[PDB]
Amino acid sequence: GMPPPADIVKVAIEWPGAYPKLMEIDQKKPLSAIIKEVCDGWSLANHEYFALQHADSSNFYITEKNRNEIKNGTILRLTTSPAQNAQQLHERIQSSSMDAKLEALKDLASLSRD
């Protein structure tokens, strides 16, 4: 026999200064992985900042619910998410050094000089 056809849908995505990106939205895949596959097509950094948007009608941002409004041949748009803004209370400055040693430590030794 043969299984039922997949619910995967082809889309065209808008972005400023570029031609529309053709790609396929798999309804089984996470939107975070799909958005990473959008922004990498234009070499755009920090995919966590981004969301998909409907360009043809509604202007609904894509979500785990709103992904079901997408059909084959939907005109979408890439945009930074309304969730991206947050209070600038702290920063992970620990990337500069994990542990500042008092002296440079080593254990290298040899029988004789080179």
Side-chain angles (χ1 to χ4, degrees):
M2 185 181 72
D7 57 351
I8 303 162
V9 287
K10 190 172 291 183
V11 299
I13 307 164
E14 294 185 346
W15 180 256
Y19 301 105
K21 172 170 171 61
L22 289 166
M23 79 175 285
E24 286 171 20
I25 288 182
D26 183 353
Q27 294 290 358
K28 302 301 97 73
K29 284 182 69 176
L31 288 162
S32 307
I34 296 164
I35 290 160
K36 193 178 190 292
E37 285 165 28
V38 187
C39 61
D40 186 51
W42 295 304
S43 304
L44 290 166
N46 305 313
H47 76 269
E48 302 297 341
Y49 297 2
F50 283 88
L52 279 166
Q53 170 60 296
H54 279 284
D56 187 37
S57 189
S58 80
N59 67 250
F60 301 160
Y61 293 95
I62 305 306
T63 69
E64 296 180 39
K65 296 186 295 183
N66 294 346
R67 60 178 248 266
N68 298 283
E69 305 308 317
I70 306 174
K71 54 76 176 185
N72 45 224
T74 302
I75 314 171
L76 298 179
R77 187 166 185 109
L78 179 69
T79 181
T80 49
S81 180
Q84 194 274 353
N85 41 224
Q87 303 304 116
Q88 301 191 122
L89 303 184
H90 294 278
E91 180 168 35
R92 196 175 66 251
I93 65 172
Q94 307 301 336
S95 62
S96 62
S97 180
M98 184 65 179
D99 181 23
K101 306 303 186 183
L102 300 178
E103 296 84 30
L105 69 95
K106 55 264 169 185
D107 65 356
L108 187 284
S110 63
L111 181 63
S112 61
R113 298 297 185 174
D114 55 303

